[PDB]
């Protein structure tokens, strides 16, 4: 349809605020939608939504549309909002006096809260009408709107205050910046772990029994960088989950799966070396081939039971307004769990493996000083990294995970996500820590030439 250059700016504004979907999806009420929040129908029939879409677009879309087609739909919604604004004696005087950029901020509010909701801002609207930008920005910052949706409102208020697109220019610079850093993190995890996996499979010297456990670690960390970290990066750079409610449950399960398998494998490796370093002869006889494959299967079976079973059975769901809101919203994929799962998952994933690894590696330090310049220094710094890097990466998260479940207000969501990325970073550190043998080095060089 007819596009303008103003029209494209208000399109990119909400593309950032609300997201763009070029395929039919469901909104918070289960209603079929496309584009930037364009309701197709309240009918539960996907074909009926496809008929409404084809009538409006003028093409057999079969549910998929282009960006230009989404802008056609978007501009119609903007025209309707504007016609509403002009019929309302509370919004027309303010609207008529605003420049085009601040005029898009007001339309943004109406898309978020509705015409009636925005008309209740009597005093802020009067201040905007009188061009009292800083005073209007202060008053709006005190709003219920600001406290409910601070990031959205910071961007909109900056638009009222300055009349520019800087809040959205800055958001987009940040988005590309983190996307770079995320892709780097994804590269290190995948490369380092795929390098360890192939080194074991193409070298008979490396196919020992201890390194069979390290293959489990490298595999739990490989899925981490192929499925968990990449999709977890989409929530950071785009502020939303973009893949529907069903994939939010699966992603959440695959993450808890791999995090459980990875840490418990560090626990098995910690036990393995303890037996070989202390009682190497009973070690070589009791730990058979099938017993080593017995532990790894047990680790993964436990990991599936604590991830796919409770999450898909909705046992992990909290029952507050904040949690139920995120569950009904496909665009929300926050980790909001109840107290029981938050503790039970933390114990099975982190706290039990921490206690074993801490106790085991402490006793290796004990029996080393009993049977004594000395090389005890080079082995102590080694233990300091195996436990230091592990603890430093996951301890902040699993402290916040248990606390936040009881006191939701103490752990900020931003801080909570950050601690979870420290744990994500362990999947890159493990191949550096556990594959430092001369056999790996001769193999790693053999693969890269």
């Amino acid at each position: 349809d007819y596009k303008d250059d103003d029209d494209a700016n208000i399109f990119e504004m909400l593309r950032i605020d609300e997201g763009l979907r070029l395929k039919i999806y469901k909104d918070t009420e289960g209603y079929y939608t496309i584009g930037i929040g364009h309701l197709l129908t309240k009918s539960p029939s996907l074909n009926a939504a496809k008929s409404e879409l084809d009538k409006a677009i003028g093409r057999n879309t079969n549910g998929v549309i282009t960006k230009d087609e989404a802008e056609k739909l978007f501009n119609q919604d903007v025209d309707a909002a504007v016609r509403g604004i002009l019929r309302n004696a509370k919004l027309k005087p303010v609207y008529d006096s605003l420049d085009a950029v601040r005029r898009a901020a007001l339309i943004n509010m109406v898309f978020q809260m509705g015409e009636t909701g925005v008309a209740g801002f009597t005093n802020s609207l009067r201040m905007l009408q009188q061009k009292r930008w800083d005073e209007a920005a202060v008053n709006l910052a005190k709003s219920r709107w600001y406290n409910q949706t601070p990031n959205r409102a910071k961007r909109v208020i900056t638009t009222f205050r300055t009349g520019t697109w800087d809040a959205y220019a800055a958001s987009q610079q940040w988005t590309a910046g983190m996307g770079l850093l995320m892709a780097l993190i994804v590269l290190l995890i995948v490369a380092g772990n795929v390098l360890v996996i192939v080194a074991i499979a193409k070298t008979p010297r490396l196919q020992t029994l201890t390194n069979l456990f390290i293959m489990s670690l490298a595999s739990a960390d490989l899925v981490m960088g192929l499925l968990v970290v990449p999709f977890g990066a989409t929530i950071v750079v785009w502020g939303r989950w973009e893949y529907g409610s069903f994939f939010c449950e699966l992603w959440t399960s695959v993450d808890v799966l791999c995090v459980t398998a990875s840490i418990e494998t560090l626990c098995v490796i910690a036990l393995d070396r303890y037996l070989a370093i202390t009682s190497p002869f009973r070690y070589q006889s009791l730990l058979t081939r099938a017993r080593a494959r017995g532990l790894v299967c047990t680790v993964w079976a436990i990991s599936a039971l604590v991830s796919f079973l409770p999450i898909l059975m909705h046992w992990w769901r909290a029952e507050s307004d904040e949690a139920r809101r995120c569950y009904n919203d496909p665009k929300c994929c926050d980790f909001v769990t109840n107290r029981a799962y938050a503790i039970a998952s933390s114990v099975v994933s982190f706290y039990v493996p921490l206690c074993i690894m801490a106790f085991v590696y402490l006793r290796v330090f004990r029996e080393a000083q009993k049977q004594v310049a000395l090389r005890e220094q080079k082995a102590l710094k080694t233990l300091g990294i195996i436990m230091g890097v592990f603890t430093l990466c996951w301890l902040p998260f699993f402290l916040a995970n248990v606390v936040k479940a009881f006191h939701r207000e103490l752990v900020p969501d931003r801080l909570f996500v950050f601690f979870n990325w420290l744990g994500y970073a362990n999947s890159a550190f493990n191949p550096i820590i556990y594959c430092r043998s001369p056999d790996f080095r001769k193999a790693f060089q053999g693969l890269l030439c």
Partner: nanobody
Amino acid sequence: QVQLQESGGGLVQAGGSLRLSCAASGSIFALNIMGWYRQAPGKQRELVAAIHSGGTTNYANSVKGRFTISRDNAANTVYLQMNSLKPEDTAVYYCNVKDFGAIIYDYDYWGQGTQVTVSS
């Protein structure tokens, strides 16, 4: 850096005895395995006696009873007091040391070897 000296080798008649001595210089980690390996012409390398820093032993069952391995208190040396020699024990005996300074893997120290032939 770390070198291990290898003494006690020689030729002897069937039924005699020997006493292999292996002294390892350099610094090593407190938990280790000092062992002896033999390779006869033809067949590949095999272990005979290993001794852990705690005291636990492991003797090849074709070799146990006749052979005894020991460690020195406050000395990085291993002694293989061997008796009741048989003509099937003609092999170069190697001194091996398992270093555990790096906790995740084993770090082998090998030796040059001492020839041992036993007369029919």
